[PDB]
Amino acid sequence: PTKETAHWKPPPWNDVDPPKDTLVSNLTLNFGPQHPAAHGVLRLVMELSGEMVRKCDPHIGLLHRGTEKLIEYKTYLQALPYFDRLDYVSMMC
Amino acid sequence: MWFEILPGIAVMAACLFIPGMATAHIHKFTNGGKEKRVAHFSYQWNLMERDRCISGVNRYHVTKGLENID
Amino acid sequence: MTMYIAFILSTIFVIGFVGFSSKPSPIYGGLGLIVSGGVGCGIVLNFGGSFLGLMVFLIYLGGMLVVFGYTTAMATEMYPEVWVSNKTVFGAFVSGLMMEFCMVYYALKEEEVEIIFKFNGLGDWVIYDTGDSGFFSEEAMGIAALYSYGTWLVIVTGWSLLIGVVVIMEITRGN
Amino acid sequence: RGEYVVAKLDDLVNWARRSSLWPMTFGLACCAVEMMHMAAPRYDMDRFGVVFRASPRQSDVMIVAGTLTNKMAPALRKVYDQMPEPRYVVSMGSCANGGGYYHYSYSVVRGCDRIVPVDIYVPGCPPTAEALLYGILQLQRKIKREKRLRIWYRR
Amino acid sequence: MFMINILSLIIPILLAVAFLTLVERKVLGYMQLRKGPNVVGPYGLLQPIADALKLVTKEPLRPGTSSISMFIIAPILGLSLALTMWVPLPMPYPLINMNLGVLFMLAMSSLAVYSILWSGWASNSKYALIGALRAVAQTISYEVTLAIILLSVLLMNGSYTLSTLITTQEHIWMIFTSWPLAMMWFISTLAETNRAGPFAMFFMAEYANIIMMNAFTAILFLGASHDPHTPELYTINFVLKTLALTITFLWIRASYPRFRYDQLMHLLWKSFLPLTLALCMWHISLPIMTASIPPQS
Amino acid sequence: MPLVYMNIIMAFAIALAGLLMYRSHLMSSLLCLEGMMLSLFIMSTLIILNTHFTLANMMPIILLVFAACEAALGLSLLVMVSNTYGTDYVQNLNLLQC
Amino acid sequence: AGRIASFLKNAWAKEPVLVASFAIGGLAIILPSLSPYTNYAIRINRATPYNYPVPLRDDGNMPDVPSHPQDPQGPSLEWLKNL
Amino acid sequence: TYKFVNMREPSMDMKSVTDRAAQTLLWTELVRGLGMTLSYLFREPATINYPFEKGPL
Amino acid sequence: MNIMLTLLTNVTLASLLVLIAFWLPMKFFLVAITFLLFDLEIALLLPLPWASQTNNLKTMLTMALFLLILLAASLAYEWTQKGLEWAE
Numbered sequence A: 001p002t003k004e005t006a007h008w009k010p011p012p013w014n015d016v017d018p019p020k021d022t023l024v025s026n027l028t029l030n031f032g033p034q035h036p037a038a039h040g041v042l043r044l045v046m047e048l049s050g051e052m053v054r055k056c057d058p059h060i061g062l063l064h065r066g067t068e069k070l071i072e073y074k075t076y077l078q079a080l081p082y083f084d085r086l087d088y089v090s091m092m093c
Numbered sequence B: 001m002w003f004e005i006l007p008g009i010a011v012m013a014a015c016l017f018i019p020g021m022a023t024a025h026i027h028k029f030t031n032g033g034k035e036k037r038v039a040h041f042s043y044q045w046n047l048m049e050r051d052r053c054i055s056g057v058n059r060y061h062v063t064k065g066l067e068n069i070d
Numbered sequence C: 001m002t003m004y005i006a007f008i009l010s011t012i013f014v015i016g017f018v019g020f021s022s023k024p025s026p027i028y029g030g031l032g033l034i035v036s037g038g039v040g041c042g043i044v045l046n047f048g049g050s051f052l053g054l055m056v057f058l059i060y061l062g063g064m065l066v067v068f069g070y071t072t073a074m075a076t077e078m079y080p081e082v083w084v085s086n087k088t089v090f091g092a093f094v095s096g097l098m099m100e101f102c103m104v105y106y107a108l109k110e111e112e113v114e115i116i117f118k119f120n121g122l123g124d125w126v127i128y129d130t131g132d133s134g135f136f137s138e139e140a141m142g143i144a145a146l147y148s149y150g151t152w153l154v155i156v157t158g159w160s161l162l163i164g165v166v167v168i169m170e171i172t173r174g175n
Numbered sequence D: 001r002g003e004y005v006v007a008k009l010d011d012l013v014n015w016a017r018r019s020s021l022w023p024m025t026f027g028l029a030c031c032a033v034e035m036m037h038m039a040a041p042r043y044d045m046d047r048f049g050v051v052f053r054a055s056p057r058q059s060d061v062m063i064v065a066g067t068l069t070n071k072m073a074p075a076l077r078k079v080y081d082q083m084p085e086p087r088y089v090v091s092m093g094s095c096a097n098g099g100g101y102y103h104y105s106y107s108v109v110r111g112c113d114r115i116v117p118v119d120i121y122v123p124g125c126p127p128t129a130e131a132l133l134y135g136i137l138q139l140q141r142k143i144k145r146e147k148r149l150r151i152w153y154r155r
Numbered sequence E: 001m002f003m004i005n006i007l008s009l010i011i012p013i014l015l016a017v018a019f020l021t022l023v024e025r026k027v028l029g030y031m032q033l034r035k036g037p038n039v040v041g042p043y044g045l046l047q048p049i050a051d052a053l054k055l056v057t058k059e060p061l062r063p064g065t066s067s068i069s070m071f072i073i074a075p076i077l078g079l080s081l082a083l084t085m086w087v088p089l090p091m092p093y094p095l096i097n098m099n100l101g102v103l104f105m106l107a108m109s110s111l112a113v114y115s116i117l118w119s120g121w122a123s124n125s126k127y128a129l130i131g132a133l134r135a136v137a138q139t140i141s142y143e144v145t146l147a148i149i150l151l152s153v154l155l156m157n158g159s160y161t162l163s164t165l166i167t168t169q170e171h172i173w174m175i176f177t178s179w180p181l182a183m184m185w186f187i188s189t190l191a192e193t194n195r196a197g198p199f200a201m202f203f204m205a206e207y208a209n210i211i212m213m214n215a216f217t218a219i220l221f222l223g224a225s226h227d228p229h230t231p232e233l234y235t236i237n238f239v240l241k242t243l244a245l246t247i248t249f250l251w252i253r254a255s256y257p258r259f260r261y262d263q264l265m266h267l268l269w270k271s272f273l274p275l276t277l278a279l280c281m282w283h284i285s286l287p288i289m290t291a292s293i294p295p296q297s
Numbered sequence F: 001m002p003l004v005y006m007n008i009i010m011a012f013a014i015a016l017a018g019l020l021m022y023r024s025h026l027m028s029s030l031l032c033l034e035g036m037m038l039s040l041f042i043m044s045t046l047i048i049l050n051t052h053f054t055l056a057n058m059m060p061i062i063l064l065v066f067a068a069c070e071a072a073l074g075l076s077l078l079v080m081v082s083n084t085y086g087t088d089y090v091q092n093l094n095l096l097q098c
Numbered sequence G: 001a002g003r004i005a006s007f008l009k010n011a012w013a014k015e016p017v018l019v020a021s022f023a024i025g026g027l028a029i030i031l032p033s034l035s036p037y038t039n040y041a042i043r044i045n046r047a048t049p050y051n052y053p054v055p056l057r058d059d060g061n062m063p064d065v066p067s068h069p070q071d072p073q074g075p076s077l078e079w080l081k082n083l
Numbered sequence H: 001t002y003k004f005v006n007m008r009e010p011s012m013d014m015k016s017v018t019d020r021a022a023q024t025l026l027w028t029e030l031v032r033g034l035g036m037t038l039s040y041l042f043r044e045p046a047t048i049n050y051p052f053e054k055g056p057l
Numbered sequence I: 001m002n003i004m005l006t007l008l009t010n011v012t013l014a015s016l017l018v019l020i021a022f023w024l025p026m027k028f029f030l031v032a033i034t035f036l037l038f039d040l041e042i043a044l045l046l047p048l049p050w051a052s053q054t055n056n057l058k059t060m061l062t063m064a065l066f067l068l069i070l071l072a073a074s075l076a077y078e079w080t081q082k083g084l085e086w087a088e
């Protein structure tokens, strides 16, 4: 032993050096709301275990109008077009 | 209906036509009728060099025949 | 003057070499030798190396240079480097170009530079020979013999490349 | 003439800026139906030189369509800043231009112009497809009424 | 004199590429219950110019993170290599009669990956790099199929000289002898062409490439006849054939959904490649089996 | 012996020095390896084509098909080294000090 | 019998591309062995002259070699003109 | 009352597998898409010439 | 002369076209290496058209078929041990 080698730790007995700490690269992607596939307003934030996905968080709310809150201050007839504006795909239903 | 695509494609057709057209004629213009003698190997090249040296006008595309020898 | 054209190809070949050998960013080092890869074919082309020159562009340039740029596009060190970021690479950059330029000037001065090998700095066109090549391209007919006279190299190369496949997957298998 | 050459160049510079401008969306709400329901064969807009395309770096006019909530407000602003110049925004729908139905609610900004400098306003709840097609036509006519190179030469 | 031909090989193509955009939209028009651009000049004839004239007038918004060097160099090569592609084409008499034109054609096609890779890497955006990462992996993947297919069909020509291709076909279109490889090549050229500010140049490059790759297939399989005394007949036949192939590029671009990434490689490695290997094996044994090996000279 | 032989000779020599002068990046050094063998490739072609050694024209191709083939390992060891450590830095290439 | 029939039936039902490739490659591997024209292929390939036909000295003992190029002696390739 | 959709029990006979193998080997469902689209092309469009003509109300 | 001219004009036209456009206004890595390893083997396979015109075609037939066999074996090996199966 010398001053230079006064800190050289002996090799691990199994030759397997201590594994490195968490080095994952779980990338976070935002698929919208500008993305056309997001269908206008969708804030999909979600994890990329490489190219493979483990959890998708659909942060809905991008179009949140408190419809029921306004419905509280209108009569039944006045509140009717709100439902007409709810599913603007199959509106009459 | 669809006959309106033809004005769209005709311009490209004519535009695509010029390169092959232009190469076809200026080769005749540069090489005097015959095509630019292709030299894919050494033989065709030194055939051309012999033609250029024998032309006297230092031009391969000028060809001299039986009239050149007396 | 295209008298010394092969000189021009030769000199820019090495300045591209000095570029990446100066150790810039790997991606910028990559482009620093693709230009050297590009010019090297020109030297071979001017010597009659049609297929061999096009090999550099196809399997060398258009082949494995892509995956090295691909690898750098994978690694992406926390900041992708550049010639500007490092000041040592600039010092080596100027050193290589100046060393080449002075030796070239010495080479074109007395044509008798004895560095490692004694050599003549005479024109590149001089070393060429005479005699027609017939109808066969010697560069193409020679390599076509791989299936006629290269009856041994195909065996070893074919075996080695297959051995190349197993080693690649086995070590990348990650136990 | 000195004014004539800048006049011809100005027209040439903006003659197709009103015919090659390509719309951009955000497609918030029911106005996002007429957004591309005009891209449907009936009220063809691809013929008008316009064609829908997101590509926020490579588009000319964005047709803001739907209800503008406060929660999305950063997203629109960052899109409009990323938008290259020249850029125009079209407020389709009563909700987009002036809040419309939800003007009094807590989670919608009262009109898009409070957030982005807003060009031609096309009204409607929703604007029936050709109404925006008419509105887009007005925008192109507005493009002609421009003296870009003329103003520069006057200075 | 030579300078005129080089310009005469570039300018009409650039005009043709300009009018390809109008063709791309409008042949998809009546194929969509649509009309296509008809307001910009007669039948949209001014749309090619209009789009090619307004894009340059837009400012070149480049992000600060993007290195101006690579962000400009990558588009530059994306066109220049795609412009020399047109050169060795055996349009009656090609510009450069390279003895190895096939290698010259394919090798320069191998450098089109660099335009995408650098312009995606320099962008320094998470969406950009994965897109560049995706595109480079796909194009180099189909490179091996591109070369193997060429080796198989060209074996019956005689040598890599593109000028010899017309002589080989002559009486019979070579699609008749390698139709299993023909659709193999047509899918391959679709994948490489990336087709299922400083931007008009890029779109022009990726659209000039569509015409040429279609032209490369036209000279390869859909042959023609060439009279030495009237090359114009070969010109019209050649441009018509490659025009139809470009139309097909537009035909299928509006007839299919997209390919998922995994299937994008599954189709090639596990389906296209082993079948291509067998066909190449078939196309080498057969000329030997029938004593029909073409002459090298 | 002309300059075309010499110019690429020192092209290898600066490449040989480059690989032997690790800065921080083994990727950069790896990129120096195949450039270094390219100098071998060009010299091989230059001599062989100059002397019309017809049968030896195969050799420059097969030089590529192994140097490029081993370059796969050069990345493959690198592509695995960059996993555990997180980078290609040769500074971390000293875990085996003892 | 039944084993190969079911297996081939199985392969063509799930992987038609794979069996087609193997069939073509497996086919191409065997035709040259029994090919009736490969013998011609070498003959015509050996009948293509790239180099000059170097004359040999005339001293008798070789009546087989012709004197004129049009002389009857020497090899004849009427087969080449016909096939 | 209801009807199924996905279930097909594709028959494994020599003739049937030939059609499936042919469909995969020489694409036929894809060319069907080409035929449908081309038939669409040779049909007059539904576009309206605004403002020279505007849709019904 | 002609070739250097041809690679000169197009790059100059490209540069001016950007001048008017600038001043006027593991698994993914693994599949790439497999491409390279096959890419090298197609290099050996390229000279085939001239190789078919050799005098000893029988030896050429064995090796040309041999190289494609190793193309198949390398692909088949990679396929059966996952390999060409891209990790999803």
Ligand SMILES: CCCCCCCCCCCCCCCCCC(=O)OC[C@H](COP(=O)([O-])OCC[N+](C)(C)C)OC(=O)CCCCCCCCCCCCCCCCC
Residues within 6 Å of the ligand: E179, E180, E181, E182, E183, E184, E186, E187, E221, E252, E256, E266, E267, E270, E271, E272, E275, E282, G015, G017, G020, G024, H024, H025, H026, H027, H030, H031, H034
């Ligand atoms: C003595 C004879 C010797 C030779 C005989 C050779 C055998 C007989 C012929 C073999 C089949 C034909 C060759 C292979 C073709 C199919 C390859 C393949 O993988 O197919 C399955 C593949 C995949 O089919 P799949 O998705 O059903 O899956 C098949 C099986 N796996 C899962 C393993 C892949 O089909 C395709 O890829 C379809 C095309 C996709 C791309 C979209 C564009 C298509 C455009 C079509 C219209 C235009 C055509 C233009 C043609 C050219 C014009 C100039």
Ligand code: SF4
Residues within 6 Å of the ligand: A085, D029, D030, D031, D065, D066, D067, D092, D093, D094, D095, D096, D099, D100, D101, D124, D125, D126, D127
């Ligand atoms: S204006 Fe009418 S149609 Fe448009 S978003 Fe508002 S409520 Fe919906």
